[PDB]
Each structure stands twice: as C-alpha cells, then as structure tokens.
Write a protein that binds this DNA or RNA. Structure first.
Ligand SMILES: [Ca+2]
Ligand SMILES: [Ca+2]
Ligand SMILES: [Zn+2]
Ligand SMILES: [Zn+2]
Ligand SMILES: [Zn+2]
Ligand SMILES: [Zn+2]
Lengths: 219, 57, 262, 204, 217, 47, 51, 51, 51
DNA sequence: GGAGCGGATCTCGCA
DNA sequence: GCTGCGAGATCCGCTCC
DNA sequence: GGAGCGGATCTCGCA
DNA sequence: GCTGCGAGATCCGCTCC
C-alpha cells in the first residue's frame, strides 16, 4: 500500500489477454490488450507505462516475462524497485486480483455499446477512474493528481532556515523509568508529546512531556 | 432538481455510474439516484446474486 | 556538486538531456553541464545568455529585435540609422544593462567593418556570424516578429508616437505574458542570474591549475596511490577526478589526496 | 470579487491573453473568456486543456501526435493507417488518459465525419476544425514535430522496438526536460489540473 | 522599498537625465535632446519597460505639471508626489552620485571618440565597476531584492498543504480496519505521526499501512 | 417513480394544484413535490 | 432465478414473482413446466417490480 | 514447514528454528539443500521448542 | 565550540562529543573534515549534566 | 410521530 | 528476509421537520 | 506493579 | 413452502495477591 506502488498482472477474457496495472494508494487502474505474454511485449508495455507517469516501485509474481534477464536490466535502467511475491501464493497480489473482478464486471456492461474491444476498455477506464467519484466525492484520478502535485521537492527546498533544538529522553519499559540516552535532535514538537528517533533501534518513538527535557539553548 | 434529472439519467445511460457518484455530481437525492440505478436493465442483468443466509433447524 | 556529477552523466547518457535541464535538475554548475553535453559523442554527431538579432521595419522606422533563446526575453529600441557607428551604439548599449556570453547574427553592411570586430574584442563576448539555414531558426524567428508587431496597434490611439508604442510592446510581452506558475520572462532572466552568480565564488579561487594523486577505496582497503589526475572541481571535502581505466568520474574525500608541486 | 473589475480594467489598458489573467488574478476561466470575447479589437483580429491533433510521417511510419497548447505535454502513438475507426479508438484512449475540454485540428478525411463528430459530442468536448488563425499553434506544433523527430532519430538505435523509441522520446520530452523555475512540462499540467479541481470544488 | 528619483544635469550645452534609486542605488543616464514633454514621456515608459518600480518621487518641472502627463502616469498605475524633497539623505545620495558620474565621465574622455557610445560606455562603467558591500553591483543588489521578495511572497505555497491521511494498526496478528479520515501532523521518512480520536494519543505509523487523501470540504 | 415525473409536471402546469395532492395521487415522494411547487413561480408568489 | 444441473448453474430465468419469501430459500412458479420450484438464496437476484 | 510443488502441498518437514519471524511469512533454514527458503504463514505449524 | 579567524568568532557548529579536558583549551573532532581541532575554553559553552 | 440518512455488516470470487 | 481484497446489497439508530 | 484468566476474534475446510 | 458450521490457536483487559 505504497504511494508510488503498482501491481501488474495478466488476465483472460473470452480469448483476450489483458494486462492490468493497479496503483495501491489512489486505486487508479490502467488496462491494455496484449497479443501475448512475451518478454518484449511486457517490456514495451511497462516502459510505456513509465512514460505515461513516473512510478517508484512494482510488485508482481513469478512468470515467464515478469522475471527474466532483459526485464530486470530494463527495470534497473529505469530505476524501479521490483518485488516478487511468494510462489503459489496468489493472495500476495490481492489488489490487482480484486481489480480484476471490478474491471470484468463493469466491462460486461459496455461490450454492446462499442464494436471495438479497445473502445470498451477505454470506456470502462472512464467509468472506473474519472466517473467513480466514490467515498467523500473524489475520483481516484483526483487523488493521484493531488499526490503527484504535492510530491514536488522544490516546495520543500524553498526554505533552508529553521530553528534547531536538542532534547534528553529516556525509555519506558513496563512503567519503569530508565536512564537518559544521549542528546537527540527534535523531529517535531507538538503539545503533550514529542517524537524521537532512536539510533540504537533506528526507530521513531513518541515520548510524553513528563519524560522529556530540553537542553538550554546556546547563548 | 427536476431539471437535471434527465441529465443524470442520460449520463448513467452513457457511462453506467454509481448512485453515490450521481448524487455527489448532480446533487440529486440519494433516493433518486438509487431509483435510477436500480431501473437500469443492463445493471440489473449483470448484478451479482443476493447474499442472504439462514440457519439449521 | 561534486557527488552528483556521475549521476548527471549517466542520466544524460540514458536520455540525452540538455545542459540547462541538467543544471536545473541535479544542481551541478552550468560549466560542468556544458562540458558533459559537449563531450557526448552522440550529441556531437538553446541556452541562457544566448541572443539573436534580426532586422525589421514598421511605418518606415528603424527598430532592432533581440530574442533570447532560453528566457524568451525581447528587447527593442529606436535606431536613428543603419550605419556602423549607430549600430555599435545600440549593440553596446544593449550590453549596458545585460551580461550575455554568446550572440548570433546574419550578414549585413553594418555587421562587418574594420572597427566592429576590434570593438567587440574589448567586450570579450563571443559572437558568431553565419547563415541561419536551420528550419527551426527560420520558423522561430518568424513568430517573434509577428508577436511583437501585433501588440503595436493595440495601444496606438492614445500613445502619441511610435517610439511610445515601442515601450508598450515590451510591457505587453515581458511583463504580462506569463507561463508556468505565473512567471514572466524577466522573472526567468532574473532567477537565472541568481544561480549564474554562484559559480563565481568557486571559480575565483580555482583559477590556478593543480595536479594531485587519488586513491581508490575498495571494501575498506586503500590499495595504493594512483595518478597523477587533474582536479576538475572543488568541494567541501570532496574532489572529482577522471579515471583513465574505467573512463568514469570518481569522487574522493579530502583525506586521500596530496599536493604535487608544479 | 474585485479581481473581475481589476482584470477588466487591465485588459482594457493592455489587452493581454486569458491564461495570464487567470494565472495572475485567479479569476474564473469563464470570466476570462467572457472578457476576451467582449473585446472588439481582439475579436476582429493558449487555453488550458486545449489540444491539437496531427499526423507525422517517419520513413513509412505513421505517428499520431497530440499536443497541449498551454503545457508542452506531448502524447505520441503509432497508427497503422489513416482510418476513422483507428482515429476514434485513439481519441477515446486519449480522453481516457487525460481530462481534456477542447480540441483543435485541421480539415481531414478521418477528422471530419458524422461518426467521429457524434462520438466527440458523446464525450462532450468542443471541436474546432479549420485553418488556424492565431500565429502560435502552427509554430508550436512545428517545434513539437521537429523535436520529436530529432529525439526519435537520436534514441532509435538504443532500443529494439519502434514503440520503445517513441516511449523513450516521450519520457525525454515530457519528464526529463525542464525549464523555467526547474519545472517539467508534466508537472505544470498536474498543477493546472489541481487548480481546476480546487476551483470547481470551491465554486460548486 | 522601490523608491526612484529623477535629476537632470547640464554639460557641454547638453542635458543628461539620471534615474536614481534610494534603497539600492541604481543609476541610469540618458541624453535629453529637447525640453518637450514627449521625450520625458517616452523615457518614462521606456524605464517602465526595462524596470518594475513601485514608488517614484521627483521635483517640479515645466512639462511634469500637465494633465496629459498625470493621465498617462495614472494609466501606468504608478504613484507620484509633488513638492521639493526635505530628506537630507536623498539630497546627499543624489549629489554624490552626480559628482561621481561627472568625475568618471570627465576621466574617460580620451578613450572614446563618439558621443552616444561615450554615454553608454560611461553607463556600463558606472553600473559594473561600482562594488558595494560584498562586491555587489547595483544591478546585482536590485536582482537580489527582487528574488528575495519573490521567494518571500511565494513561500506561502509550501506551508498550505495540510494533507489528510488514513491509518491502521495490527491487532492480534491481523490488520485492523481503515480508521479515519484524519489530518497528519508530521510526516518524515519511513513513518508519520498522527492524532488518534479513540484514545486521544499520538501514534506513529509506517508508510506501508497508510493512504493519502486531500482535505475534505 | 421517475417515468411519471414529466407527466406529473405537465399535469401541474395544466391544473396548478398543491404538492400534497400530487404526492398522494401520483406516488411521488413528498420532497420532490415540494420542490416542484417551489419551482412554480405562480404557486411560490401567492404564498 | 436459475436452476443448477449436475452442479453447474444454468442461465438466468425470469423475471418472476416471489410466491413465498423464506429466509433460507424461496418458492417460485415456472411457466415452462407449470410446476413449483424451491430456489436457494444463492441463486436469486432481487429486482424491483417492472411496469 | 512444508513446500508446495505444482500447487499441491508436500509432506511436513522439521522441526526447525524460525530464523526470522515476519507477519506475512517466515524464513527457515533447510538441511537437505543447505539453502534459505521463505514459507508463507499458511504452510507453517508453530510448536514449542523440543528438549 | 566556535572557530576564530583573526579575532572574529564563528558559530557554535552544533553539539559535538568531547575528547579530553585540558587546561585552557580542549580538543574536539570535526565531522565535516574528520580533523581534530583545539578550541580555547572561553570559546566553548558547556552543556550542563542531566538533573 | 413520519422521514431520510450515514455507517456497520454480510458473502463471494478474483488468482 | 513479507504480506487479502472490496463492490454491492440491506437494514437500524439516528435526528430533523 | 507481577500474575493468570475469561472471552472476543481469526481462518479454513468439510460437502 | 427453508436455512452454515465450529475447533484450535492467540493475544488484551481484566483484577487479585
Ligand atoms: Ca493472477
Ligand atoms: Ca456430505
Ligand atoms: Zn446503468
Ligand atoms: Zn548526449
Ligand atoms: Zn482585448
Ligand atoms: Zn403551479
């Protein structure tokens, strides 16, 4: 369930092979009719998918084209993290499997409307991406657009000046206080609590103000 | 209200959206959207079978 | 700076970007990006401070056109005559408020003269004269003149003269025409000058060639000293060098380098 | 509210374009179009989500090119031949991938037909067919064609499939290329779409 | 902030107009042929083309007091005030700039041969060789001020994000329901911190079990 | 109850009755009849 | 409603009226054979009455 | 733990030590092939350590 | 610790680990250059121990 | 007291 | 050195007119 | 604060 | 003129010593 995380899978529908990509966070889907399951076709489709929008990670299962020599080289060339699920565990890629149902059920309705199968695929993409408007009233494409817009790093790089403070904290095991463990840089200061990154465990922890003290500022 | 009802009906005919989508888009009542979606012959034909279960004697 | 040079090089090898794009993306100095782009064999086989000059007339009056390749900045001013002296006056008055580095122009009676080349030699800005046979240049030059001349009649009736509309055209083009996040072309130029000024602070102390040795770290094993290798650019404890064997740029800390006297 | 009178006064004084007024005052797009139409000088003589469609020949290869006027976003595909069915499929896929609102093209056999016109009315997008009058679309599409063919010539030997080279050129010209304040021709489109969404949500 | 001034000088039976800036120190020179108001108007609009002012102050002039002139300056939207300045700082700056430019131009006489070339070359030398503070040209400090004001005006964009997020927890070895929606407090690499409503306690949750949603109406 | 809405509207135009009678004789929901009679300028202005 | 033959479900048939509504299953009237049938809740599709 | 071949699960093997405990699956050490394997939670049987 | 250049002090450079406490000056380790430096006592601000 | 309405709850089938 | 999922129906308990 | 403990919750596979 | 089911694991929240 990552932000730029995509799951890809094949499916069959009445002597037709469809390749489906599903975005984990927003729920946006992208389906394409493919003649076969060869490595070259998958490479072309996946680099077109990268061209349309920039992902960061991919999840897939074992397959003749998902795992090979050329495809791994292509993914390294593009710079996409690739993860392979446990064999004989189709439940691993649950999201794409559920989108298979949600795609077939809707595509059953639009077949009579259009003579061309690709037209039906585009229509079901319309009705499942833009015209869904589910939940609070935002289509998945809107969520994807917002997430892509807020991902800009230049906004984060606009300001380079910020106050820096350090803190003293101790662990809390079974209600028993421990000992102060070095000075730590404050990550974010709210009300009634604070966040500290423990280097020994390399993990983020939350400490109440009763177990937090502040060093005097430089003077 | 009444004026945009044909617009919502034709939009659902063209795209076969959901009742919640129609209510959030055209501002029609949820009951009206439910009536529109339930009256679609295509939607009724391809709808999933009902899921009600009982218990033994 | 030093660290991300190989990343920019490999990205350009993958996609064949341009120097301006590399500078804006990876933050490398413009000189480094230009060097990387120029050394590309495929590219060998459009930039800031690069302008083009064309001649045009309207209502029997002399006007000069200055089109910037990147920032899309247009400048104009009334010219009394097409003679060499008046042409030089306008050309160096153009440098009075601007600091370019390259310029291109066609062949003209006032372009070539015994005193024209020596005058620009003192300025030091490189200028190239040639025939613009590129279809891209032909189609790009055409649209600029139409764009600047269309705005002329939109404000003639309440301005007294044509030289009054001269400033109105610049107001219409360089001030109000905005793209991106509401960015004017003059805003683009001013922002470009900001990152253009940065490299002076580094090149001020780098104007003296040095030879130094470099040592390659492999799994924590220093190995040996290798060199000599020319120092490309300086950094805060990082130095980039060229590898003779692998033909790749390497980054080394300041603790694995010595000074070789000249 | 006062932004509308301010934009009206500024257009009276200078006669700028609608996109600049929308970007610099945040006025509604409909109001900007109304102001533009109400100018007799402009009428008698660069829109968001405005697209241009063209064909390209590449040493027997047919390429369909879609160019966004406001943002330099290019969508290129390979077409077997100039046919109404293929054009309808391609345009429906294009509407599937983006959220356009208007389209401009020339007078062509597949472009002008009862079937395609009915389909585009079905989608709900304004269509304008004829000789362009604004001296900006022709130059922009010429630059797009020139850059696209140059990049295709550059990147063809690296990959095997022609569609692979086309995808690589789209990557180079849509994401990797940058300009202005370090912005890409694809991030600008996302920003414009987000602004349109938030304005529509705020209004209705 | 963005204050401008005008002053004329007479040399060799010729008139030179000088544009002066107070906060930064921009200096511009031009040769005024006649005293007609048309030359002043075209010079002012050329200056408006090459510069973006906000406030301008100047003394009285024979052509300045004219209904057409005020109408044009209001068409441009710039502001202007009448009356002789009483600020000693402005007078001192104007006098120093004028004496410096006169000294530089009289020192540079033998190098040139023409006149307009001479004026523009003097403009180049005055606008380039003037190193103030950390070796900053007046145009350099002007562009510094412009970029500083632009970045301080555009810095509000990065602050108005307030994005919303969902979250879930692991209970008895199985994932829980998607609790939310809610507003994220601080989001760093690996995990984000959020406020919980069930127990009114802060909870840190990794990125592998969250969803990102724009804020509702 | 959507198919008879235009017919009910034209009947209202012919007769100009009140919302309760329309709801009780046509099966239309009460809210729809209230909005219909609200849209009626003649019925709205004489209240 | 649909009828299962040898486990494989058949094509959907109807629409028909629910003669008797039961929690586990329902009873429907067939036109082809003029005989009563009992159909479980997993092979039914409730729809509003047509007009 | 057990290994699935062509979908059909194999005979149970072990007992072995849980080298790395994960929520979705675990990593175990094999004696026959001296190789590491990842086994999903649906093919494991937790037992107390023998003595 | 703050650095001095011809009588002009620098900034505190953030907290750093101490090495040894001498008389009149102390020795510290720089993180940017991994170089050991010496700083006078008057230019060093002591961090009080936890209370 | 009529009224609609937001949300918890149910099964089943993608592989 | 990792992983189940949600769309499409149905009522309760609610509050508001 | 340590301690065990009753009970809600989970999946999967009979046909 | 009728129907899904529970055994076997695992923690939380509890209170009592
Ligand atoms: Ca599958
Ligand atoms: Ca049995
Ligand atoms: Zn429908
Ligand atoms: Zn190159
Ligand atoms: Zn106009
Ligand atoms: Zn009425």
């Amino acid at each position: 369930r990552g932000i730029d995380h995509w799951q890809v899978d094949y499916t069959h529908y009445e002597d037709k092979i469809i390749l489906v990509w599903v975005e984990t966070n927003s729920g946006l889907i992208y389906a394409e009719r493919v003649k076969g399951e060869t490595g070259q076709e998958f490479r072309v489709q996946t680099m077109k998918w990268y061209a349309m929008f920039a992902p960061k990670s991919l999840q897939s299962d074992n397959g003749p084209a998902f795992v090979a020599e050329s495809t791994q080289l292509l993914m390294k060339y593009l710079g996409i993290e690739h993860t392979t699920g446990i064999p004989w565990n189709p439940q691993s890629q649950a999201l794409v499997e559920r989108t298979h149902q949600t795609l077939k059920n809707t595509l059953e309705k639009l077949i009579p409307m259009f003579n061309a199968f690709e037209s039906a695929l585009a229509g079901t993409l319309i009705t499942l991406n833009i015209k869904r408007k589910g939940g609070l009233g935002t289509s998945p494409m809107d969520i994807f657009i917002f997430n892509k817009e807020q991902q800009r790093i230049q906004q984060q790089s606009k300001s380079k000046q910020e106050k820096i403070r350090f803190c003293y904290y101790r662990t809390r095991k079974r209600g028993h206080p421990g000992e102060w463990q070095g000075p730590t840089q404050v990550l974010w200061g709210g009300d009634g609590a604070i966040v500290v990154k423990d280097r020994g465990t390399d993990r983020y922890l939350v400490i109440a103000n009763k177990d937090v003290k502040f060093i005097p500022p430089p003077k | 209200w009444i004026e945009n009802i044909p617009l919502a009906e034709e939009e659902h005919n063209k795209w076969h959206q959901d009742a919640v989508s129609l209510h959030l888009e055209f501002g029609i009542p949820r009951t009206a959207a439910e009536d529109i979606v339930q009256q679609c012959d295509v939607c009724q034909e391809n709808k999933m079978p009902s899921t009600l279960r009982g218990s033994n004697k | 700076w030093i660290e991300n040079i190989p990343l920019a090089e490999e990205e350009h090898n993958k996609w064949h970007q341009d120097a301006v794009s590399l500078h804006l993306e990876f933050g490398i100095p413009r000189t480094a990006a230009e060097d990387i782009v120029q050394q590309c064999d495929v590219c060998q086989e459009r930039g800031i401070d690069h302008w083009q000059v064309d001649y045009t007339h309207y209502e029997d009056k002399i006007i000069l056109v200055w089109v910037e390749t990147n920032s899309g900045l247009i400048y104009a001013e009334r010219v009394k005559g097409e003679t060499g002296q008046e042409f030089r006056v306008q050309t160096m008055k153009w440098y009075a408020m601007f600091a370019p580095k390259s310029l291109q122009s066609d062949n003209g009676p006032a372009f070539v003269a015994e005193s024209t080349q020596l005058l620009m030699k003192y300025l030091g800005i490189e200028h190239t004269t040639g025939i613009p046979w590129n279809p891209q240049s032909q189609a790009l030059v055409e649209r600029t003149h139409q764009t600047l001349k269309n705005t002329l009649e939109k404000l003639i009736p309440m301005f007294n003269a044509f030289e009054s509309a001269l400033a109105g055209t610049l107001i219409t083009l360089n001030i109000k025409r905005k793209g991106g996040l509401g960015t004017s072309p003059m805003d683009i130029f001013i922002f470009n000058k900001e990152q253009q000024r940065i490299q002076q602070q580094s090149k001020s102390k780098q104007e003296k060639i040095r030879f130094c040795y470099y040592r390659t770290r492999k799994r924590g094993h220093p190995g040996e000293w290798q060199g000599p290798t020319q120092v490309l650019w300086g950094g805060d404890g990082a130095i980039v060098v060229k590898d003779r064997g692998t033909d790749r740029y390497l980054v080394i800390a300041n603790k694995d380098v010595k000074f070789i006297p000249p």
